[PDB]
Structure formats: structure tokens, C-alpha cells
Design a protein around this ligand. Structure first.
Ligand SMILES: CCCCCCSC[C@H](NC(=O)CC[C@H]([NH3+])C(=O)O)C(=O)NCC(=O)O
Ligand SMILES: CCCCCCSC[C@H](NC(=O)CC[C@H]([NH3+])C(=O)O)C(=O)NCC(=O)O
Ligand SMILES: CCCCCCSC[C@H](NC(=O)CC[C@H]([NH3+])C(=O)O)C(=O)NCC(=O)O
Ligand SMILES: CCCCCC/C=C/CCCCCCCC(=O)O
Ligand SMILES: CCCCCC/C=C/CCCCCCCC(=O)O
Ligand SMILES: CCCCCC/C=C/CCCCCCCC(=O)O
Ligand SMILES: CCCCCCCCCCCCCCCC(=O)O
Ligand SMILES: CCCCCCCCCCCCCCCC(=O)O
Ligand SMILES: CCCCCCCCCCCCCCCC(=O)O
Ligand SMILES: CCCCCCCCCCCCCCCC(=O)O
Ligand SMILES: CCCCCCCCCCCCCCCC(=O)O
Ligand SMILES: CCCCCCCCCCCCCCCC(=O)O
Ligand SMILES: CCCCCCCCCCCCCCCC(=O)O
Ligand SMILES: CCCCCCCCCCCCCCCC(=O)O
Ligand SMILES: CCCCCCCCCCCCCCCC(=O)O
Ligand code: NI
Lengths: 147, 147, 147
């Protein structure tokens, strides 16, 4: 089985799902507190901030998953998982901040982006490591060629 | 190949994609019926309900995929696929209900959430089964130690 | 390792992540240019068009990933990757068009949908190829039976 090579990625993934669920329930709770009934996603500022925090997190969640898995498979499982943990924690802080004030969402936002780009960089390096040698070899061989 | 261990997950996944596509085309059709042109996502209640049904389904679709795959790999492929089928059916009913009335979206919504949490629980149990024995052993060994 | 069987899918995936990130930064830039501060996602038409382009791309991005991977695993890795590249290029053109005018988003939109349905069709054929023979055999055997 290849379960062993991906269990941490799977665990972080599940943690991310749980965190998103948490955000969703928080939005339903703001819908009750500030009396906003579906459909319609406009209301008091505090509701709009909670709603909006949830929407942004939802929009970024697939980016996180894709890169987490690519980085974890092509670069290193543990590093990718760590960045994922930091990312998710950063996102929890983003949601809480935004819920209190637009400005307080900002620090954890930046933290979440650094973690996410790190995941990207690891994904990119891992892919580069996979493709670049064969390509260079093929290029040298074609030059060779001469002969 | 590991295709055999994941083909049902892949089939349910594809079914989910198809269902989302269906939702999208239904939104374009409500855009024509109630005369709402892009951008701008406000209009009559019925349009806002169709739009909103589609948006919620879209937001939950990655949660579904992640857990489906984790549950299917770490717990049991068939069970995970079944829950996925129920989930997707529940989501189809959610979209149809919401399209008719906000209140009629509610029963299939609850059905979709139960299926989704079941997927989560299976994912969680499977991950627990993978990590917990090695951890307990390591802990016992460290205690041993004495000696 | 099975890295070799999926590296192109992973590369296209990473490219898609990068493209989404690009869209996000473009939205932040329209937020500055046309003075729209979070929360609140209403403003001048040009902002609403950029915002909306980003939202639609985000909503379709998981559909793309799912089908890309299924098609790439069950049908053919290279074909799936190609369709993915075309899709993503089409999406870049969609975002740029929409940013200039609602009508100019339309041609690349259609291009993106054709590529996406092609991915779907490849996913479907690959799954059909996997499941249909065993099913037919089982059915013939049950007929046999007689005897
Ligand atoms: C992993 C298990 C998931 C747990 C599901 C609990 S239900 C919560 C879910 N809440 C949300 O999506 C919040 C955001 C949503 N965009 C909204 O505006 O209501 C919902 O169905 N909201 C809208 C609705 O009531 O239809
Ligand atoms: C799996 C194959 C997918 C089939 C694609 C068909 S195109 C439909 C697609 N429709 C939607 O996304 C509906 C919801 C969207 N949020 C909206 O408000 O228009 C679209 O491009 N909508 C907005 C637009 O016209 O740009
Ligand atoms: C792969 C690496 C990703 C790079 C991240 C850069 S930050 C950009 C990000 N921008 C967006 O999401 C744009 C769309 C968003 N829906 C919005 O309305 O602001 C954001 O956090 N927007 C809202 C906010 O400022 O909180
Ligand atoms: C859409 C999100 C991305 C999904 C990608 C996951 C696909 C994984 C398939 C290959 C895994 C093979 C085992 C790992 C090999 C290794 O660690 O080198
Ligand atoms: C982002 C969504 C999650 C993607 C996860 C899929 C990754 C799968 C890689 C490993 C698969 C190896 C074969 C299955 C082994 C088994 O059934 O025990
Ligand atoms: C949610 C997005 C879909 C994730 C699916 C990826 C799962 C891949 C697991 C199996 C991969 C095994 C190696 C490939 C085998 C082959 O090419 O035939
Ligand atoms: C390097 C170690 C990474 C650990 C990831 C643990 C995830 C726990 C989530 C439940
Ligand atoms: C065989 C040709 C494939 C080239 C793709 C290179 C991807 C690099 C990603 C960094
Ligand atoms: C597999 C063989 C590796 C070929 C080496 C290519 C040379 C460039 C590497 C730096
Ligand atoms: C246990 C059986 C699960 C069957 C899943 C079939 C999915 C069909 C979707 C096309
Ligand atoms: C090696 C340490 C990894 C610990 C992660 C545990 C995840 C459990 C998920 C339920
Ligand atoms: C692999 C060997 C399993 C070690 C058993 C650990 C004991 C706790 C299990 C309940
Ligand atoms: C068939 C060839 C497919 C090539 C995909 C290359 C992706 C490059 C993205 C960096
Ligand atoms: C064993 C039964 C599984 C049937 C699922 C068929 C999926 C076909 C997808 C096209
Ligand atoms: C694995 C053996 C294949 C059985 C052949 C079934 C006949 C229908 C194929 C067309
Ligand atoms: Ni293998």
C-alpha cells in the first residue's frame, strides 16, 4: 500500500475539512445572531465580515489541497504537512480576526500566504527535480550529435 | 496499477462533477428566465435561490472530494462511495428544493450533512487506525525503560 | 514510485494554482484602483467584472482538478494534461476578457467549457473501460446458467 507515504497529507487534509466545517457553522451562528435568513448574504458589518471570512477561506481551500499533495508527493511529505498545519492555523486566526474587525484579519492573512507560497515553492522544486535531469540529458544527447 | 483500489471513488467523483455542471447550467437558465445578465448576482427571489443553491453546493464540493478520497483510501472504498452517492443525491434534492422555496431546501440539506459527517467519521477512524498503534507502541517502549 | 505516472498532472495542477493566485492578486489590484475595501464586493462595473471573473474561475477550479486527475489516471496522462493546458489558457483569456468587457469573456469561456467536457468525456470513457468488461462477463456468466 501507499497509505504510509501519504497519511500525514491525509490527516492535514481532514483537519482542513474540519476547519472549513467549523467556519460554516460559525456563519450559520452569525445568521442567527444578526438575524439574516437565506438567501441574501448582506446584513450588519459583523455578519458580512464572518460571511466574507468563510467565503475567502472556501475559495483558497482547493489551492491549499492541490499544493499540499503535490509538495508532499514530489518534495517531502513532512515539510508539506508542516506548512499545511501552519497554513491552517493561520487561516483559523484569519477567520477569528476578520470576525472581530477587517483590520485584524490582516496579520494571519499574511501568515497564511507565506505558508501557501512555501508549499508552492516546494511543489515547484519537486517538479523541477523530477523533469529537469531527463530534459538536460535529452538536450546534451541531441547536441552530441555531432559524432 | 492502483486503479482497481480507487475506481469507485473516481466514478463518484465524476458523478459529482457532472452534478455541479448541471447546477451551473440551471443557473444560466435562471439567468435567462428571470432576465439577469452578468456580472450582478441579484434579482428576483427565485433567481437568488437558484444562484445561492449553486454557490453552496460549489462551496461544499471540495469538502466532499477530500473526505471521500481519504475515507475511501484509509477506511473502505465501497462504504465511502456509498456515502458519496447518498451525499450527492441529497445535494441534488437540496438544489431542487431551494429552487422551489428556501424552506424545501432544508430536509435534503440535513441529509447531505449526515452523509458528509459520516464520511468524516470514516476518514477519522481510518486515520486513527493507521497512526494509533505505532504511537502506543512507541509510548510503551519508552516506558520500558525502566530496564 | 508512481510519481512518473502523474508528474504531468501534478505540473498542470501547480500551473492552475499559480493562475488562480494570479487572479487573486488581480482582484486585490482592482480593489485598490477602484477604491473598494473589504468586506463588500460591490463597486464600479469594472471591479465587479474582475471580482466576478475570479469567483467563476475559483468555482470551476475543483471541477477541473477532479476531472484532470480521473482522466489522466483512467484514460491517458498526456491527453488529459493537454486538455488541462488548453483549459487553463482559455481561463486566462476568460479572466482578461471579462476584465475588459462582459461580452469579451464569452469566446474564451466557450473554449474553456469544450476543454473541460473533453476531460469529462475522457474520464467517462476511461471509467467505462475499467468497469464494463467485468460487468458484461458477469452478466453472460449469469445467463450461462442455463447449463
Ligand atoms: C463537514 C460537515 C459539514 C457540516 C455542514 C453544516 S451545514 C452549514 C452550511 N453553512 C454554510 O455553508 C455557511 C456559508 C454559506 N455560504 C451561507 O451563506 O450560509 C450550510 O449549509 N449553509 C447554507 C444553508 O443553510 O443551506
Ligand atoms: C463540466 C463542464 C462545465 C459546463 C460549463 C457550462 S458554462 C456555465 C457557468 N455557469 C455558472 O457558473 C453558474 C454560476 C455562476 N456563479 C454565475 O453566476 O453565472 C458559467 O460559465 N457561468 C458564468 C458565465 O457565463 O461566465
Ligand atoms: C498561492 C498563493 C496565494 C496568494 C495569496 C495572496 S492574497 C489574495 C487574496 N485575494 C483574493 O482572494 C481576491 C478575491 C476575494 N474574493 C476578494 O474579494 O478579495 C485575499 O486574501 N483576498 C481577500 C483578503 O484580502 O482577505
Ligand atoms: C487534486 C489534488 C491532488 C491529488 C493528487 C494525489 C495523487 C497521488 C497519486 C500518486 C501517489 C503514489 C504514492 C506516493 C509516491 C511517493 O511518495 O513518491
Ligand atoms: C485532494 C483530495 C485528496 C487526494 C488524495 C488521493 C491520493 C491517493 C494516493 C495513494 C493511493 C494509493 C492506492 C490506494 C491504497 C489503498 O487502497 O490502501
Ligand atoms: C480529488 C481529486 C482526485 C484525486 C485522485 C488522485 C488519486 C490517485 C491514486 C492512484 C494513483 C496510482 C498510480 C496511477 C496508476 C495509473 O496510471 O494507471
Ligand atoms: C512533520 C510532522 C507533521 C505532523 C502532522 C500532524 C497532523 C495532525 C492533524 C490531526
Ligand atoms: C516531458 C515534458 C514535460 C515538461 C513539464 C515541466 C514542468 C516543470 C514544473 C516546475
Ligand atoms: C537519469 C540519468 C541522469 C542524467 C544527468 C543529466 C545531467 C544534468 C543534471 C544536473
Ligand atoms: C458499494 C457500491 C458503490 C457503487 C458506486 C457506483 C457509482 C456510479 C456513478 C456513475
Ligand atoms: C507521526 C505523528 C503523526 C500524528 C498525526 C495523527 C492524525 C490522527 C487523525 C485522526
Ligand atoms: C505493528 C505492531 C503493533 C504494535 C501494537 C501496539 C499496542 C496497542 C494496540 C491497541
Ligand atoms: C503531452 C505533453 C503535456 C505537457 C504538460 C506540461 C505542463 C507545464 C506546466 C509548468
Ligand atoms: C461494481 C459496480 C460499480 C459500477 C460503477 C460504474 C461507473 C461507470 C462510469 C461511466
Ligand atoms: C477480464 C476478462 C474479460 C472478459 C470479456 C467480456 C466480454 C465483453 C467485452 C466487449
Ligand atoms: Ni504501487
Amino acid at each position: 500500500h501507499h497509505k504510509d507515504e501519504v497519511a500525514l497529507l491525509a490527516a492535514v487534509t481532514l483537519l482542513g475539512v474540519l476547519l472549513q466545517a467549523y467556519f460554516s457553522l460559525q456563519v450559520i451562528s452569525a445568521r442567527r445572531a444578526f438575524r439574516v435568513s437565506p438567501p441574501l448574504t448582506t446584513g450588519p458589518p459583523e455578519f458580512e465580515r464572518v460571511y466574507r471570512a468563510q467565503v475567502n477561506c472556501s475559495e483558497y481551500f482547493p489551492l491549499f489541497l492541490a499544493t499540499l499533495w503535490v509538495a508532499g508527493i514530489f518534495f517531502h511529505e513532512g515539510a508539506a504537512a508542516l506548512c499545511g498545519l501552519v497554513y491552517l492555523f493561520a487561516r483559523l486566526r484569519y477567520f477569528q480576526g476578520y470576525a472581530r474587525s477587517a483590520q485584524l484579519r490582516l496579520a494571519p492573512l499574511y501568515a497564511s500566504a507565506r505558508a501557501l507560497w512555501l508549499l508552492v515553492a516546494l511543489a515547484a522544486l519537486g517538479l523541477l527535480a523530477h523533469f529537469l535531469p531527463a530534459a538536460l540529458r535529452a538536450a546534451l544527447l541531441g547536441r552530441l550529435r555531432t559524432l
